[PDB]
């Protein structure tokens, strides 16, 4: 078994696609925080904000970069980027690195990111490799989920191959050549192969030979009237989904989320809290832990925006905004800012 | 297996049709933006707006181009256009290129778009190829989904082919042909073919006469009354749909969403937030990253309009507008602009 | 297999009928747009508006013409009309052309519509052929959906013929004729068929004949206890529908749209957004791209009217109009214009 | 197969009956129209109105003529009437013609309506044949639906004939009459044909004898206990209905619409918008294209009235009128006109 | 098969009974219409109103006459009455004529109603035969629905006869009198025929004999384990109903109208619009087309009253009348006229 054959499972493909792409769709904002604890969102004039929101490097989009990082984070439990910085020490480029080529080894109290580029060993400090570092016991690396999923994936590909092959044989069931006691010539015996090479493929339908001996031949295989050849296929989707923690109604099972929450907003809230939330924290805290300078901690901060998911329907959002009317929890201008309407006296 | 034989699957055709069409149906606009963050939608006198909205080239419509680009972006994970620009260096044309003929390679620290034109091997810069660059680990190219889907597609076409030819055989099962209990001449053996083999057609009916030397012929097919046959077909639709991430009830299967909101608007939000959104991001971001010049970033901003999907029914939209009329979140003039009614004092 | 035999499938016939006819039923309006951005609907005095709304040519209705164009657009992915224009360059006739006879070939930078009329090659520029050009990768032609549907159609016509001919044979199931050793005379062997031919056809009911050997006969047909011989007949409708993207409850499956939207308006909204919308855009944008002169772009515009579908029931439309009462979103005169009631002081 | 044997299918009869009847039941009116777009319904003193509403010819009713025309338009995709006009050139009669005897051909740039009258071959102009010209690729003639439906109709009539004949033979299965190994005289054969075969009739329950050759007689019918028999009949109703586009619950099948609105008004809207509407368009447009002279276009306008279908129940209509009374969208006099009540001050 | 045997099918009997009787129950009113477009209902002093509402001839009731006409109209697609008139040309009698004896033949431009009275040919003009003329392609006669229904009726009577006979035979299964090879005399063997007949008949339960050769008998009746003998009986009802267009829940199928309309009024509205309406129009328009003199057209008019069907329950009609209270859409006197209550100051 190998990683690409595993990635060819539709369920795996979908999960990885979904998680990475969703977190890549979110707006990411950067803030300067005043001493009275007020946020100001910062502009593309700020070097870090430009690096993040506009361009990570001379080859990529921001969206594209976050997606690419997150794919490795999910697939390998870990993702790595080269960090580049100017003479003032401010970062100026980020560039993803293939996790499969990375090693990280401690060196006395220190750490070295040992990157195997082909047959060359590009060795780096904690100050120039970002390392998003997923779920794992050591706090030094995430556990690579692909490495654990290998057995259930093994079951899934085994069934899929059997299922293919049965229909590829035109459902011509395998036969015992159960026989009798007549002397057969070696050519009579040879006919059993010699006449054929089509009991898998070709339309020798009414015609599959036996010798001048009649014989008693009968089927060997169990037939996919063994209902596992359906039911078991369905069952595997849950097994694979459980490595990623994805609600199976988003994947395709049964129908829809039967007793859990009614409207779309409840589904989104559930999906956020039980699945999407960790990645948000991993990104935001890593940025705070390594990219923001220690003197700017507490002043400078970064957040993903959730409203693109938490968006309810027209009726609910109208009712919500009306509930801000009395109570006065917003001005008309603040509400008009949420949908970029022109400001108005109030 | 090949891409055309795959695209002939109704599911695959429908998925690509749906996504590419829907995003091509959206309105797409550009705003100039003031320093106080007021929008100003720009006119067809602006070259970029004209290019995007009226005409991408002297052969095509805007819609028609966006559609074609998006089809490649889904099918191959990547799409490419040749850019062209005037003596001022401002863009004046876009023309699609075959993702199947394109290659992108790093060449020193630079990159080259190698395009196989027919029997020639053109090379191009990041300066002149637009490259929409979908989902993938490198951040340099997208994973071509057709390449991964090939196995489940292989199963689907295997089942489909087998399923047909059973009825093409007049629904008669494969048979073991024992040559009786005595040897016969090679011509008598040839007459087994003269006697039989046309059992795939209708009219044979009764001339299935056992010759005067015993014989013991019987069936070796399992019958489509096996527990796979029908259910097997249904299952595989989901497998193919998962490569594109489309909710199967939109693909026309079985039963519609019971438990995430019943109203059409909630279906649209679900489809947007979990399927359409990323493509919207990729377009808008690519335009901002490569086509809008750096000096105009934050001044100029391209966006799609969502309202064509987020449209509610008469009752909901009436209630919504009334809830903005009271509270005063809009003037009558703003609301009348949404449905292009003549303005009034307000 | 051939296009007419495919068109004889009820599902295909219905889909093509529905889509083309619905878009042909819609009102199509033309507008002059004032510099203050107010629409004026234009009259049958305008040459283009008359060409469109009243008469495309000396043989046809407007409705009839739009229908005819749209049938080819759906069936072949493409539709073509000869364009005719006066000495002032204004268009004066449109005439549809059979897509199967069309070729389009590039000629250096130029394009030639190569029309094979019988054995003659009527060759035309982009300035005199309209070309509605559907969904496809090149932006130069739409993919012809019939060409892809051919395989699922193949399965469908196979099952249909088997289903017929089983009852055409009165379900007189086919048989082995057997004994083991008696010499049949060549007349006995003749009579084994020559007595009959009505074993397929007529009422030989209680009296198929042996010859003088008793016989030990047995059957070879599977019986339509084969679950496909009902379940598959149902299933294939979805396959065909997926080439056109039609919601199967409009076609005939199960009952009605189970969990999707309650009232008729929600069904119409769904059908518009997920199926009908693209054709609207293709028409409207093609008109804008080729028929309206470049100097009149932005001034002159055309729209289909959706209200004939978006029409809710009496109660909902009454409630809607009442909700315009306060809020004041219409005068009584504007509402009376929606149903052509005489205007009244207000 | 033939058209009458097809029309004898209950489905086909019902579909044609329904559509042609319903559109013939609608009121049809003409408005003269002022330059300020006020309607004025015209009187039976107007020749065109009299022709349309009182009498199409000295043999028929208006309703009766519209019905007959529409039957042909559905059944043959086309319908034709001979026009007649007075010395002023104004129309004074319409008479239907057989679509089965009509042909239309291009003749130079002109067209000829070739009509086979009996054993003669009359020819007519576009000036004197009305030609309602239904759905089809050319825009010159409609596709005759009966021609495409013939295969599924073939399947339906095959089953219907088989179903009869089973009970007509007293529900006794077909048999191989196997006697044994004795040679038979032609009289002994004649007595197999007369002692026996008669069993397929009614009364001979008692005796059916076997001679001293010992016999081996056995059945070859599958029995209608097979899984097709009943469900087969049901399925085919949908197939035929799809050529006409009628919702099967209106055709009296199985179960009524669960999930597009329960109220009768929503059934009517569904049937209108998805089935009836196109015919309404074809009539009104044909009249405006050929019968109303060019100088009167936009002044004179023929229309059907929809209210006979859009009629709500007592509760809904009361609420609706009250919602126009308040708001003031009607006078009492207008509302009293709808149900022809005497007017009052208002 | 014959018309009376067809009429003996309960479904056919019910449909004809229902339609004809319902339209015969309706009030029929005649109106003089003032020039200001006000209706006056006319009295039994008017000759036509008396002929219609009180007495058609010296033998019949009005109800009875309308019923009788409508039965022929449904059954034969056509109904005919002799028209009689005074010296002033005003009609004074109507008398129905058996449609089966009628022929109508054109005579140059003229028409002759050729009535075969026994062996005599009573020949008449359009001025003295009324001819209600139902649904049909020519506008000269209706298609006789009985003539088309003959095949499905054929299936139905085949089942019904078989179903009778099986139980009339005491459900004894018909027997092959199988044996072996022992001799018996022809006189011994003849005792089968001599003795028995009660295998088809009645009381001999036990001593069905054999002649002295031991015997080995077997059955040949399929049994109504053939589910058609139940399920198909049910199915036939729809086939027959479809010739008349009657909603099968009114006839007896399943239970009640499952998803279609809730209260009785919705059922009545549906039944009116989709089934009853055409006959109303046929009557009313025929009266207007032939019985009312041309000078009185527009002045004199006739309508059936629908309120006897459109009658909702006590609660709904109370709520309705209360909704007329404010709004003022009736006076108390007008409402009291609807239920013949004495008028009162208002």
Author numbering:
A (entry chain F), B (entry chain G), C (entry chain H), D (entry chain I), E (entry chain J): 52 to 397
Quote the study that presented this structure, word for word.
Tailed bacteriophages and herpesviruses use a transient scaffold to assemble icosahedral capsids with hexameric capsomers on the faces and pentameric capsomers at all but one vertex where a 12-fold portal is thought to nucleate the assembly. We have determined the portal vertex structure of the bacteriophage HK97 procapsid, where the scaffold is a domain of the major capsid protein. Assembly of this large complex from hundreds of protein subunits requires transient association of an internal scaffolding protein or domain that acts similar to a chaperone and is absent from the mature capsid. The mcp gene 5 encodes a 103-residue N-terminal scaffolding domain (mcpN) and a 281-residue C-terminal domain (mcpC) that exhibits the HK97-fold including a triangular A-domain; a P-domain, composed of a long spine α helix; an adjacent three-stranded β sheet; the flexible E-loop; and the N-arm.
The asymmetric reconstruction of the portal vertex shows that the portal and surrounding capsomer density were equally well defined, indicating that the portal and the five surrounding hexons have a unique mutual orientation. The portal clip domains visible from the exterior exhibit neither strict 12-fold nor 5-fold symmetry, suggesting that the 12 portal subunits adjust to their incongruent fivefold environment. Besides the clip domain, the portal density exhibits strict 12-fold symmetry and the 10 towers of mcpN interact at symmetrically equivalent positions on the side of the portal (right), but leaving two specific positions unoccupied. Visualized from the capsid interior, these stripes correspond to ten ~100-Å-long towers that surround the portal and originate from the surrounding capsomers, two towers per hexon. The towers were readily modeled as trimeric coiled coils consistent with residues 2 to 66 from mcpN and accounted for all 30 scaffold domains around the portal. Thus, the scaffolding domains adopt a pseudo-12-fold organization, buffering the 12 to 5 symmetry mismatch at this special vertex. Cross sections along the portal axis showed that the portal/mcp interaction is mediated by mcpN, including some of the surrounding S76 to S88 α helix but primarily by the flexible spacers and coiled coils that adhere to the portal’s 12-fold symmetry. Our model of the portal, despite lacking 50 N-terminal residues that are not visible in the density map, revealed several contacts with the scaffold that occur in a groove between the wing domains of two portal subunits in Fig. 6B. We observed that only one of the three coiled-coil helices interacts in this groove where it is surrounded by a polar distribution of charges: lysines (156, 160, 161, and 346) from one portal subunit and aspartates (94, 135, 141, and 169) from the other. We show that no less than 30 mcpN domains interact directly with the portal.
